[model samples]
Each structure stands twice: as structure tokens, then as C-alpha cells.
Target: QLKSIVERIERLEEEKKTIADDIKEVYAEAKGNGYDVKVMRKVIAMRKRDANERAEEEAILDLYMQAVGE
Candidate 1:
């Protein structure tokens, strides 16, 4: 069961890479169409940063809930 779970995770990681590459390709195409790629990249990065922050907040909340017997 553990090995199967690991294999599934590995496959998902590979799929994620493919999807990320597709996103990059689309961003490049947008740039070719006269869009500001630099700004677009910044916006994407900012959204990712915000997501990380939210994840951190949730983790802290979970910790506090555990402490309070929630």
C-alpha cells in the first residue's frame, strides 16, 4: 500500500511538471502577442506568495485548534 501511494505521488508530480510547462508556454504566447510578460510573471508570483501565506495561516490555526481541543 505504501509503495502504491508513493508511485501515485510520483505520477502526480510528473503530471504537475507537464501542466506547469504548458502554463509557461501559454504565458510565452501571450508575451508574443504583445502582453507584458514581466508584469504577468510578477502577478503570478504574487498569487503564489499569497497562497503560501494562506497555507501557513491554516497550519497555525490547526495547531491552535489542537491545543484547544477543537
Candidate 2:
């Protein structure tokens, strides 16, 4: 069981590396195409920030519902 868990973790690590490489390639391609990669990164960051805020709001809603027995 330990060996199987180790192998699974290794496989996920490799997959994460591949995904990071793919994101880098996309950014490079966007830069080559006359798009500002930095701006793209900023837009992605903002979206991530907004998503977190929305998730927190949803959690608060759930807590409110539980408190009110709704």
C-alpha cells in the first residue's frame, strides 16, 4: 500500500510539471502573437481572486442557512 501511494504521488507530480510547462508555452505563444503576457497573468490573478471571494460568500451563506434552520 505504501508503494502504491508513492507511485501515485510521483505520477501526480509529473502531471503537475507537464501542466506548468504547458502554461508557460501558452504565455510564450501569446507574447509572440503581440499580446501582453503580463496583462494576461494579471487578468488570471484577478479572476482567481474573485473566485476566492465568491467562494467565501457562498460559505457564509451556508453558515447563515444552518444557523436559521433553513
Candidate 3:
């Protein structure tokens, strides 16, 4: 019974790896088109958050930016 559960998880892990490879290929294509993949990745992550959440986060960052003399 325990072995069945482990085998099920191993199959899902393999599926996850395949999906990750697909994402990597898409990123490579974007880079080939001369888009800044690094910055794009950052924007993708930020866009996942709600605007209200991001607004408060950015506000705090601005305060810290002044403290650091930036």
C-alpha cells in the first residue's frame, strides 16, 4: 500500500519536470527575441500579486530606499 503511494508521487514528479522543461523552452524563445528574460521573470512574479498588496509593499520599499540613500 505504501509502495503504491510512492509510485503515484513519482509519476506526478515526472510530470512536473516535463512541464518545467516546457516553460524553459518558452523563456528561451523570448530571450532569442531580445527581451530581457531576467526582468521579464521579475515582472511575471510581481504581476501574480494583487495590486493592493503590491502597493503596500512598494510603499515600504520606497521608505527603505530613502533610508539607504537611493
Candidate 4:
């Protein structure tokens, strides 16, 4: 059982590294084309949130910003 778990985790770790490298290359490509990596990352992060959750957060943010005169 220990051997199986170790092998499984090793395989997954290798795959994770490969996927991370692939995503890094994608970011490099986007940078070459003049896309802002920061905003791209933000959009990706926002996409991960639920629609209702994002909307609620945005509403709160707007209210807070407005209250602060921003």
C-alpha cells in the first residue's frame, strides 16, 4: 500500500510540473503578443469564482470604493 501511494504521488507530481511549465510557456507567448500577464491572471482567477459570488464581491467593492470617494 505504501509503495502504491508513493508511485501514484510521484506520477502526479511529475504531471503537475509539466503542466506548470506548459502554463509558463503560455504566459510567455501572451507576453510576446503584448498581453498584460497580470490582467490575464486576474481574469483567470475571477473566472474560477462563482458568478453570484463574484457579483456580490464586485457590489461590495463598488460600495466601498464609492464610500471612500474613489
Candidate 5:
């Protein structure tokens, strides 16, 4: 009935919204101190990958650069 799991789904969705607000506040504080939020967000995403994963991804980009002779 109605996906049958809306109970926990509603609770977790609410929690994620609250956590998003917390992340927004921290980003604002960093920007206030003149930190670049755009670059910081990229750094966060990049760090989310394992070091080996990151290295392999970068290696592919390096190959692309070489292919273009850049």
C-alpha cells in the first residue's frame, strides 16, 4: 500500500533536509572568511573517492591530455 515504506522514507528525507541546512551554513561561514565555496565543494567531492580511485581517474585525464598533446 503506497510503496509500503513511506514511514521510514519520510523520516530520513526530513533528516537529510536538516543536514543540508547545516552544510549550507558551514559553506556560508567559509565564504564569509573569503574561502572559495566552489573549489571547496569540488575538493569535498574529490576526497569522497578512495585514493586509488582518485589516482586511476586522474590517470585517465592525464592520458586524455596527452592525446590532445596539451
Candidate 6:
């Protein structure tokens, strides 16, 4: 019932925190090696998008940038 749902969510939340901490360590290691963490994050974000969706967004972005003389 509700009690089971609550416990399940608590367990998942703990796991989520652990996963985030692990990812943070990875970013810290990358930074230690002189990698740009900000750009790495952006690359990861792009990787999450479907290729076609990213391409469409990039096309629009390129058009807008060119329109502004960028």
C-alpha cells in the first residue's frame, strides 16, 4: 500500500544520490586532468538527445545565429 510506496521511493532516492555522487567524482577527475567540465556536461547533454532531434535544434540554432550576424 502507501507504506510500501513510501519505502520504495526512499530507497530509490538514496540510490539516486549515490549515482549523482559517482557522476560528480567523474567530473572532478576530468577537471583534475585539465578537461573543461562545462563543455563535457554539454556534450553529455547532447548525447542524451535523439540524433534527429539534435540536428533539427542545431539547424534552427544555426539559422538564428546567422540571422543575428554571428
Q: What TM-score fits each model?
A: 0.56, 0.74, 0.56, 0.56, 0.51, 0.54
lDDT of each: 0.96, 0.96, 0.93, 0.95, 0.91, 0.94
Better of 1 and 4 by lDDT: 1
Per-residue CA lDDT of model 5 for 1-70, tens digit only, reads 6666887798899999999999999999999999999999899887877676989999999999999993
Query: Candidate 3: which stretches are off by over 4 Å?
Result: 1-4, 51-70
What range of 10 consecutive residues in model 1 has the weakest lDDT sum?
Answer: 61-70
Best by TM-score: 2
RMSD of candidates 1 onward, in order:
4.8, 1.9, 10.0, 9.9, 9.2, 9.8
Against the correct fold, how does model 1 do in TM-score?
Answer: 0.56
Summed over model 5, clashes come to 0
What lDDT does candidate 1 reach at residue 21?
Answer: 100
Local error of candidate 2 at residue 23 (angstroms): 0.9
Candidate 2 has its poorest 10 consecutive residues by lDDT at: 61-70
Better of 1 and 2 by TM-score: 2
Where's the lowest-lDDT run of ten residues in candidate 6?
45-54
- Which scores higher on TM-score, 3 or 6? 3
Q: Model 5 — which ten-residue stretch has the worst lDDT? A: 1-10
For model 3, what is the C-alpha lDDT against the true structure? 0.93
User: Candidate 6, which segments miss by more than 4 Å at Cα?
Assistant: 1-3, 50-70
- The count of backbone overlaps in candidate 6 is 0
lDDT of 4: 0.95
Model 3 lDDT per residue over 1-70, tens place: 8999999999999999999999999999999999999999999877877676989999999999998993
